[PDB]
Amino acid sequence: GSDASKLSSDYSLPDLINTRKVPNNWQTGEQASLEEGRIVLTSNQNSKGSLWLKQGFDLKDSFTMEWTFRSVGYSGQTDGGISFWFVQDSNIPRDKQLYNGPVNYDGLQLLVDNNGPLGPTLRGQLNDGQKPVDKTKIYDQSFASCLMGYQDSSVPSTIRVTYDLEDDNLLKVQVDNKVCFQTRKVRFPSGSYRIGVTAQNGAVNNNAESFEIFKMQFFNGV
Q: In three state form, how does the secondary structure of 106-175 look?
A: EEEEEEEECCCCCCCEEEEEEEECCCCCCHHHHHHHCCEEEECCCCCEEEEEEEEEEEEHHHCCEEEEEE
At residue 134, what are phi and psi to the nearest 5 degrees? -85, 105
Residues 6+ apart with CB under 8 A from 94: 102
Structural resolution in Å: 1.1
Number of structural domains found in the chain:
1
CATH number at residue 118: 2.60.120.200
Is the Cα torsion angle 66, 155, 70, 122 positive or negative in sign? positive
Distance CA 62, CA 114 (A): 31
Q: Helix or strand or coil: residue 55?
A: coil
Distance of CA 15 to the CA centre of its chain: 16
Neighbour tally for 50: CB within 10 Å? 25
Distance CA 52, CA 196 (A): 4
Asked if residue 173 lies in contact with residue 182, where contact means CB atoms within 8 angstroms, the answer is yes
Q: Is 5 exposed, middle or buried (0-12, 13-18, 19+ CB in 10 A)?
A: exposed
Residues 6+ apart with CB under 8 A from 140: none
Which conformational region is residue 95 in: left (phi greater than 0), alpha (psi within -120 to 50 degrees), or beta? beta
Distance CA 85, CA 151 (A): 20
DSSP run (H or E) holding 67: strand 63-72
Asked if residue 195 lies in contact with residue 8, where contact means CB atoms within 8 angstroms, the answer is no
Residue range(s) defining the domain that contains residue 111? 1-222
